[PDB]
């Protein structure tokens, strides 16, 4: 049905791929002298009815992945595994 | 009488088709303005044929062109025979192909096609009875693969009964004049099972190699390949043209010649071809010309006729001569060379005799053999082909123009099964 | 007609286009003020052809070509010079200052206010011409105004005229010897706009074709006058076969369909058979097999850029002059032999010749001379990605130190653009490591 | 014969006067002493034709001119410079003072005792013509005289003459350059009469011609001289189809039929092609398809004024020298492919062609040349709304503020008589808002 779905698709598969450990309130707290706070907003109302698609994945408490649409040279899409690692890594 | 129709498509099929009306016209004593100044009355007779004629005693031949993309244009026009046409039928467009086949059969020929039918229609109606369609195309390039297989898509579709004949230049093992090669061959032969009577397999290779091999050229340019292959073209309907004593339409070689309907490539031969000045040192006989036309560096496919067991065959002699001699000549033949025919035919060989012979020589002759041995010509680009197809290597240049990835392995299938239909008869039993 | 819009962009881009239009009035006949009395005296031929001329009603005859430089210092050469009555007088300069060699001065600040006379001056210059389009773009990696004003320049031209062919024809930053310490942050800002939109990118470089002005020519101090002349006759018989009567001609849509194997490796890396000194222009036979045997060494390759350490995808031998097509298939039947030059299981095909037989002719001032036949051979191999290592190191060296990059962010630009150009490269280079290594089963 | 009656009111009027009669005298022959030396060496043909020259039996030529300023320093120029001898001696001077750029100095003060001398001027000029009529007004906004004294001339000739067609050639205030402080009062009371009485307004504007006298024809200091010829060129090509001999002639009744399609929505915006240098007078072909896309950008409209920001109602292509009518339709097709050139859905014919195959001539002293074909588009747009409002809002700006207004009503008129013409434009614009928007079903 909708147009954009098959980015999405691969998206819903990758989200079983790894392990989701999330961040739960009431964790210890380490030195961190320089600390990067890093939170993501809530999906707003205006986003599902203009058919958007949530792209920022959140696995674990230091760190967070980002994908994005792309294609390979024989035009076939993939998803780029953006990795990074933060302290600090909201939901 | 029998009249025939010559289309040109592609930038290989009207430089054939300009040094073709200029073997015909040679033949029939007609000049670059189409003034008959022909020695003997036996030549005007079935002038019908290629030219119709024209108001004050000059004749056109019915020669559409639709190859003639700009480049191509002022050169056909400038050449020897450019004020011999008709300049209605110069149908063209503009952006040719550019070696693409979903540039020739989809996005140009489309709108197109319309415009060369629209001359086909009044190409067929100023004429008694039509059964030929000529087309010189080629393999391989961008117009003469996939705009010349439209229009055959068209023609059988509005005439399913005339004789289509499409001398078909195929690609090489070597030389390779263009990168996208084994698919303009695989999309167009896909069409050549489906629609025609009979095509000929004609390569560079084995025309390069009679001008070095037995003609003895220094430098053979393209003139001299192109030479060579119309002296078959007018080889084929010499008994339409002229009297014999055992004639051959275009019809009586494509019965005979065929067995099945899909087994229909044949490997075009002439002789007698030799290097001299005026000092030669043989003998043109009968038995002198059938040892040449047999010879396997006398072929123009490009593929070893040893390799595999000949179907059937047609030598179209032309000249005077005397038919014990042709007919034991076309015996011995085949019982020298039991092997390299099939059993199980009662007798391979046909045989067509003319009695008009070319200008200057005094006999000659042409071999159309139908051979098990073409096999190769499918095997090699059958191999190039799923090499290319496998990485999906040229395919955003074909898909971009509107074709779809289940229409490449429907033309591999189809070119997968000749050779399937070729390697059984070609085994003993 | 076919025709071509030649645009060059950049000082490179217009000091190539001094010799690429002194040579194309030398072969047609046109003097420097537009006249043809050279074809006058036979009373025939429409030589002057319109791929490249436009032809007004008194005989004069006027270029496709249009010039955007952000500088008036390189054009005030030319509304001064010898062709200063040639050219159209809209030779755009209107620049009140210089880009300064950033990619932010760019596809932003100073770009952006003059690309309005740009886009409407190719308009009315467009609707003059009936047939195939092609865009010879000229311009350099590395600079101000040919890496970010081209970059500017594709991304409004891909909207307003789609799927033309666009062959723009880049100087590429050497290994060894750049003019410019901020030359390795241009060229892989550029890269961004000439994957996505520039269907075919002919990348040269001058310190190979330094070497060939050395060893072959034999001159020992090469001007920038010396090596334009070189790129002038490579883009001759580029585009010679849209003019000239050849016998196996190769339009501008055919190198799209031939050279291009995947939409993202368009880099095919030009040669040439320049080997007339013109003392050595005797001595020596050139014949078909000798001179196709010029693009064996990697002593004549115009990119500092080893062959012989990569595979190749697709080749383009393309001739002029005294050509006959037979000698062609033996010098190609020695190079499929030869086990140094090595192709990919993929391609078996290999070649496609395109033989125009119009010799290339001699600009009078030196420096080689008329010889009877020549080569252009055009080859996306594999070896082109480590011409691109050897310029994300230089990227990547002062990246980690933080240099130059105020001048860039400061200029409109977010600096994170600069990453957003090394995972494209970083990615485009892992895309050479993939096509020529052949499957196994 | 046909003819016309060209009264000149203003100093506007009169100054664009020196120049429409300096381009007529010698496109017919006739000499600033009246006589037609050149037409006597041939022997034959009436060229000075009858619809701007009165013939006497002395072979002396008049011109059907009157003209009226209430000031003696704009006509002493002409009773003293090379146009002394040629005009009747009855150059409406009489005023003992000017007008001082108001509206009621006016209609009531002074235009009022010197009309009658005009009606009657113009009752001795009307009585000697058979046939057709037509009264080529010339005056601008925003003047004294211009405004005010134009608006009596209208209503005392829409009685006296009754349904005869009136083009009136006004000069409107730039919507940023103005050269008086009070001409956004004159400009929006002149509407008042100009809506009722003159059928046809064709506006041109100062800001919209300079920048033509800049980009086009490169002049870097165009003086009023350089202005006025330009529109000159105009007025011929308006009123050529009354003279000379054409292929589709359009009668002056012909616009009333064409461009107007609501009895108030009369103003049709005038352009031209005078992309003539004459250092461009080469390099460039001048075909029917590029001088037709001279309308396209607008940058060559004459009014400051963004046609792309709304619909066209109907057109009104005006050609001149050597065109032929079939090249004409390949420049119309292209018009109506281009999505931006966008009309109403209400009239689907859009075009109408006039050929006049008399070329343009050139005014010797610069500053165009001898170019062999032109046009003059005529097209009521939508977009001319947008022209009044940045005028309307400096009216409103210094009308709450009641400024300057003390010198409008202490001169006979009432002060009410300003939101008796803010009523108009205020409903006039709002006919534009309903006229290009289409209905639905
Ligand atoms: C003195 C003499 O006898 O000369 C012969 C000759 O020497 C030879 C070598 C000719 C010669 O042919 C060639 O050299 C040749 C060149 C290019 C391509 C193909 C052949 C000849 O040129 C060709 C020419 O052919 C004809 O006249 C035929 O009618 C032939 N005509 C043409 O191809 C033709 C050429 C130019 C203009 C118009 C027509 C023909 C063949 C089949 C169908 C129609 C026409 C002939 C017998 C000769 C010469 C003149 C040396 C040969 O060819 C033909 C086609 O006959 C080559 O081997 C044969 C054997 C001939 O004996
Ligand atoms: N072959 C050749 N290379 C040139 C020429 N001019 C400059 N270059 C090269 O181009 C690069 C510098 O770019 P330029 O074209 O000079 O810079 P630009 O495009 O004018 O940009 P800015 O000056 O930065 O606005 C260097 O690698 C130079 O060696 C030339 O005339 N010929
Ligand atoms: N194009 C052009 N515009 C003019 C000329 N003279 C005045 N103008 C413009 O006309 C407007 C001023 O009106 P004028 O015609 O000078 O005034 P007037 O009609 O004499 O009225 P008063 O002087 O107020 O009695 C301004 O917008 C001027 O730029 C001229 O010769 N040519
Ligand atoms: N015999 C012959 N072969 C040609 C000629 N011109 C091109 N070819 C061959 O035709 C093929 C290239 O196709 P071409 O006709 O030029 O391309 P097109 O114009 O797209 O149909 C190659 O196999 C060439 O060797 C010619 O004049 N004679
Ligand atoms: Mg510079
Ligand atoms: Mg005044």
Redesign the pocket.
Known sequence: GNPNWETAQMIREYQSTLEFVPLLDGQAVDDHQITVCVRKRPISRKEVNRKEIDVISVPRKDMLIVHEPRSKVDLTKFLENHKFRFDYAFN | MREIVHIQAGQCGNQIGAKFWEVISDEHGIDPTGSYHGDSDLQLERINVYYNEATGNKYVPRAILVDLEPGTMDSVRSGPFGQIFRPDNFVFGQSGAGNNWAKGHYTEGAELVDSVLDVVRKESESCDCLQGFQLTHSLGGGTGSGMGTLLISKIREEYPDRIMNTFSVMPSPKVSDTVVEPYNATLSVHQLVENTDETYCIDNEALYDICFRTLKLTTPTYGDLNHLVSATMSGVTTCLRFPGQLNADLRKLAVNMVPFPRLHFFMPGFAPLTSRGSQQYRALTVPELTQQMFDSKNMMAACDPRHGRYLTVAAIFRGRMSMKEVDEQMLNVQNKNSSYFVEWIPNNVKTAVCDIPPRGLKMSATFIGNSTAIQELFKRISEQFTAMFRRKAFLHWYTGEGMDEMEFTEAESNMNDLVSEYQQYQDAT | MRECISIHV????V??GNACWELYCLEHGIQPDGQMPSDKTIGGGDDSFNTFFSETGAGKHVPRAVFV???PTVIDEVRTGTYRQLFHPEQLITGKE????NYARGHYTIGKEIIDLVLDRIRKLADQCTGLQGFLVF??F??????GFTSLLMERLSVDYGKKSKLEFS?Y?APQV???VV?PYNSILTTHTTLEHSDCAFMVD?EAIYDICRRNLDIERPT?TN??RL?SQIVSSITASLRFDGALNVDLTEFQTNLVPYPRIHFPLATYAPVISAEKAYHEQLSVAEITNACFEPANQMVKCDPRHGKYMACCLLYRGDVVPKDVNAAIATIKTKRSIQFVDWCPTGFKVGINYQPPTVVPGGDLAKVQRAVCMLSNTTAIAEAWARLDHKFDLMYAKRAFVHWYVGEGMEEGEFSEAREDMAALEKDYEEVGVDSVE
């Open positions: 950049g000082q490179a881009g000091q190539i430089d952000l500088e210089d880009a300064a060699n311009h350099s590395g600079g101000g105004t040919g890496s100087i930053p750049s003019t410019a030359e001058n920038y090596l334009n790129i």
